[PDB]
Scaffold this active site. Structure first.
Site, PDB file in Angstrom:
ATOM      1  N   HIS A 195       0.570  -1.299  -0.642  1.00 56.83           N
ATOM      2  CA  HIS A 195       0.014  -0.478  -0.085  1.00 56.83           C
ATOM      3  C   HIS A 195       0.677   1.096  -0.094  1.00 56.83           C
ATOM      4  O   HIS A 195       0.949   2.427  -0.390  1.00 56.83           O
ATOM      5  CB  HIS A 195      -0.815   0.328   0.807  1.00 56.83           C
ATOM      6  CG  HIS A 195      -1.809  -1.150   1.488  1.00 56.83           C
ATOM      7  ND1 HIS A 195      -2.833  -1.740   2.722  1.00 56.83           N
ATOM      8  CD2 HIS A 195      -2.284  -2.301   0.230  1.00 56.83           C
ATOM      9  CE1 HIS A 195      -3.637  -2.469   1.659  1.00 56.83           C
ATOM     10  NE2 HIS A 195      -2.641  -2.987   1.297  1.00 56.83           N
ATOM     11  N   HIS A 232      -9.188  -1.675  -5.471  1.00 57.63           N
ATOM     12  CA  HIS A 232      -7.999  -2.302  -4.394  1.00 57.63           C
ATOM     13  C   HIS A 232      -6.644  -2.934  -4.982  1.00 57.63           C
ATOM     14  O   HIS A 232      -5.681  -2.954  -4.632  1.00 57.63           O
ATOM     15  CB  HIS A 232      -8.044  -2.814  -2.809  1.00 57.63           C
ATOM     16  CG  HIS A 232      -7.436  -2.908  -1.775  1.00 57.63           C
ATOM     17  ND1 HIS A 232      -6.438  -1.820  -0.802  1.00 57.63           N
ATOM     18  CD2 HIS A 232      -6.470  -3.789  -1.019  1.00 57.63           C
ATOM     19  CE1 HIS A 232      -5.896  -2.455   0.080  1.00 57.63           C
ATOM     20  NE2 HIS A 232      -5.579  -3.527  -0.624  1.00 57.63           N
ATOM     21  N   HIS A 277      -0.251 -11.329  -4.555  1.00 56.73           N
ATOM     22  CA  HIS A 277       1.310 -10.702  -4.488  1.00 56.73           C
ATOM     23  C   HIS A 277       1.820 -11.945  -4.682  1.00 56.73           C
ATOM     24  O   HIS A 277       2.713 -11.939  -5.179  1.00 56.73           O
ATOM     25  CB  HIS A 277       1.188 -10.969  -2.654  1.00 56.73           C
ATOM     26  CG  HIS A 277       0.361  -9.921  -2.087  1.00 56.73           C
ATOM     27  ND1 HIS A 277       0.784  -8.308  -2.624  1.00 56.73           N
ATOM     28  CD2 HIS A 277      -0.380  -9.819  -1.146  1.00 56.73           C
ATOM     29  CE1 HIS A 277      -0.837  -7.631  -1.887  1.00 56.73           C
ATOM     30  NE2 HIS A 277      -1.259  -8.328  -0.842  1.00 56.73           N
ATOM     31  N   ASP A 329      -2.748  -3.014  -4.524  1.00 60.51           N
ATOM     32  CA  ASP A 329      -2.040  -4.423  -4.306  1.00 60.51           C
ATOM     33  C   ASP A 329      -0.873  -3.873  -6.015  1.00 60.51           C
ATOM     34  O   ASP A 329       0.167  -3.919  -4.778  1.00 60.51           O
ATOM     35  CB  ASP A 329      -3.046  -5.634  -3.648  1.00 60.51           C
ATOM     36  CG  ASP A 329      -3.402  -4.528  -2.726  1.00 60.51           C
ATOM     37  OD1 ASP A 329      -3.491  -3.994  -1.363  1.00 60.51           O
ATOM     38  OD2 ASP A 329      -4.396  -5.684  -2.464  1.00 60.51           O
TER      39      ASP A 329
HETATM   40  C1  LIG Z   1      -3.888  -9.760   1.007  1.00 60.35           C
HETATM   41  C2  LIG Z   1      -4.795  -8.684   1.043  1.00 60.35           C
HETATM   42  C3  LIG Z   1      -6.159  -8.701   2.258  1.00 60.35           C
HETATM   43  C4  LIG Z   1      -5.741  -8.236   3.277  1.00 60.35           C
HETATM   44  N1  LIG Z   1      -5.908  -8.095   4.337  1.00 60.35           N
HETATM   45  C5  LIG Z   1      -6.566  -7.295   4.721  1.00 60.35           C
HETATM   46  C6  LIG Z   1      -8.062  -7.695   6.270  1.00 60.35           C
HETATM   47  C7  LIG Z   1      -8.714  -7.241   6.756  1.00 60.35           C
HETATM   48  C8  LIG Z   1      -8.757  -8.342   7.940  1.00 60.35           C
HETATM   49  C9  LIG Z   1      -9.812  -8.051   8.992  1.00 60.35           C
HETATM   50  C10 LIG Z   1     -10.509  -8.027   9.311  1.00 60.35           C
HETATM   51  C11 LIG Z   1     -11.576  -8.342  10.721  1.00 60.35           C
HETATM   52  C12 LIG Z   1     -12.435  -8.499  11.567  1.00 60.35           C
HETATM   53  C13 LIG Z   1     -12.667  -8.119  13.258  1.00 60.35           C
HETATM   54  C14 LIG Z   1     -11.579  -8.957  14.253  1.00 60.35           C
HETATM   55  O1  LIG Z   1     -11.751  -8.214  15.071  1.00 60.35           O
HETATM   56  C15 LIG Z   1     -13.203  -7.400  13.207  1.00 60.35           C
HETATM   57  C16 LIG Z   1     -13.936  -8.232  13.149  1.00 60.35           C
HETATM   58  C17 LIG Z   1      -8.574  -9.335   7.285  1.00 60.35           C
HETATM   59  N2  LIG Z   1      -7.398  -9.386   6.098  1.00 60.35           N
HETATM   60  C18 LIG Z   1      -6.497  -9.466   4.956  1.00 60.35           C
HETATM   61  O2  LIG Z   1      -5.854 -10.305   4.658  1.00 60.35           O
HETATM   62  C19 LIG Z   1      -4.645  -7.512   0.932  1.00 60.35           C
HETATM   63  O3  LIG Z   1      -5.153  -5.707   0.760  1.00 60.35           O
HETATM   64  N3  LIG Z   1      -2.913  -7.192   0.815  1.00 60.35           N
HETATM   65  O4  LIG Z   1      -2.513  -5.553   0.429  1.00 60.35           O
HETATM   66  S1  LIG Z   1      -5.761  -8.692  -0.625  1.00 60.35           S
HETATM   67  C20 LIG Z   1      -6.821  -7.332  -1.091  1.00 60.35           C
HETATM   68  O5  LIG Z   1      -6.459  -9.927  -0.403  1.00 60.35           O
HETATM   69  O6  LIG Z   1      -5.171  -8.447  -1.724  1.00 60.35           O
HETATM   70 ZN   LIG Z   2      -3.966  -4.051  -0.309  1.00 57.46          ZN
END
Ligand SMILES: C[C@@](CCN1Cc2cc(C#CC#CC3(CO)CC3)cn2C1=O)(C(=O)NO)S(C)(=O)=O
Ligand SMILES: [Zn+2]
Length: 297
Positions: free
Chosen positions: A78, A235, A262, A239
């Site tokens: 990011h 998004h 990734h 990424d």
């Molecule tokens: C890897 C990826 C996703 C990354 N994330 C974002 C992300 C948010 C999440 C949560 C939660 C929650 C909760 C609660 C508990 O407190 C409140 C209920 C888990 N998670 C996760 O694995 C990304 O953006 N990488 O840059 S992606 C878009 O898939 O490529």
């Molecule tokens: Zn991301």
């Protein structure tokens, strides 16, 4: 000429790791011509510096992680997206802990903080990596490809079945100054389904509605909903611009991802670099004839 850019002033932010849940202090610093983006673990003695490059990527599990020995800089995608988007060649990124702060889940706070501080054009030609041939990689159905294009354009398709998508496709041209408007504020996203397991593998520990779109079975949980109807796939583009910047220079070409994360993003750069007939380094001694333009500094 299209000139190399650094930061005009130093930037300090404080946040939390998305995966570690750790408090981290971020310091972005000006850096000299042809430094590239260098991450620095300043909590360690001595300080441990990892250049933001494809060769330094470790695991690519729920984020892009840079590694040198046992030492890591996690979730660089990011911040690198923000730097790539604003055309930042050279900068030291100091961290007080292993993971970049998640902020709101977007690159928005980074682009805001950077542009508040402002940019410094440097007395050296900005180098670009021009795509010369198609370069594709496939992990069964998931797919990532560079094709030649006169400018910078990123296309992406979410393929998976969940009620919340009302298919998420998008295709954006960043040859001009579209990044801040189009993708910068696209937040990361995760599913209530996966949280129990992710926390069990020490991931999403800092995850919440504050720094992410959280997706239950049928509804977005976030009080205030989405920033764009195509926020999810915007998004995936955010990424992609981050991961692609690990080439260490701005791209002159097109990226297309079909369910690419990734893992594949990094496979793509590894193959691109290997295939030296598929790319070359170019400068522009006259910005008026260049296929890319950037915001005033
Ligand atoms: C890897 C990826 C996703 C990354 N994330 C974002 C992300 C948010 C999440 C949560 C939660 C929650 C909760 C609660 C508990 O407190 C409140 C209920 C888990 N998670 C996760 O694995 C990304 O953006 N990488 O840059 S992606 C878009 O898939 O490529
Ligand atoms: Zn991301």
């Amino acid at each position: 000429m299209i000139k190399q850019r650094t930061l005009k002033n130093i930037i300090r932010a404080t946040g939390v790791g998305l995966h570690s849940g750790e408090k981290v202090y971020l310091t972005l610093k000006p850096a000299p011509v042809d430094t590239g983006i260098v991450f620095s673990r300043t909590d360690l003695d001595p300080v441990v510096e990892i250049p933001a490059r494809a060769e330094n990527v470790g695991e690519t599990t729920m984020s892009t992680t840079l590694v040198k020995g046992d030492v890591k800089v996690d979730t660089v995608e990011h911040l690198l997206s923000a730097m790539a988007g604003l055309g930042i060649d050279n900068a030291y990124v100091e961290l007080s802990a292993s993971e970049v702060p998640i902020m709101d889940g977007s690159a928005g706070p980074f682009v805001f903080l950077i542009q508040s501080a402002g940019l410094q054009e440097q007395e050296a030609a900005k180098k670009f990596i021009r795509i010369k041939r198609e370069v594709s990689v496939e992990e069964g159905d998931k797919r990532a490809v560079f094709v030649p294009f006169d400018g910078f354009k990123v296309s992406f398709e979410i393929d998976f079945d969940h009620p919340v998508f009302r298919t998420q496709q998008a295709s954006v041209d960043f040859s001009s100054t579209s990044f801040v408007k189009e993708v910068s504020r696209a937040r990361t996203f995760g599913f209530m389904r996966d949280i129990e397991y992710l926390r069990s593998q020490n991931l999403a520990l800092g995850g919440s509605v504050e720094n992410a779109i959280v997706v239950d079975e049928n509804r977005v949980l976030n009080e205030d909903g989405l920033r764009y109807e195509d926020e999810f796939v915007k998004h995936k583009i955010l990424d992609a611009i981050g991961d692609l910047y690990l080439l260490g220079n701005s791209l002159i070409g097109e990226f297309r991802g079909f369910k690419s994360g990734h893992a594949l993003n990094n496979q793509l750069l590894r193959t691109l670099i290997a295939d030296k007939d598929a790319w070359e380094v170019v400068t522009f001694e006259d910005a008026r004839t260049a296929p890319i333009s950037y915001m005033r500094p």
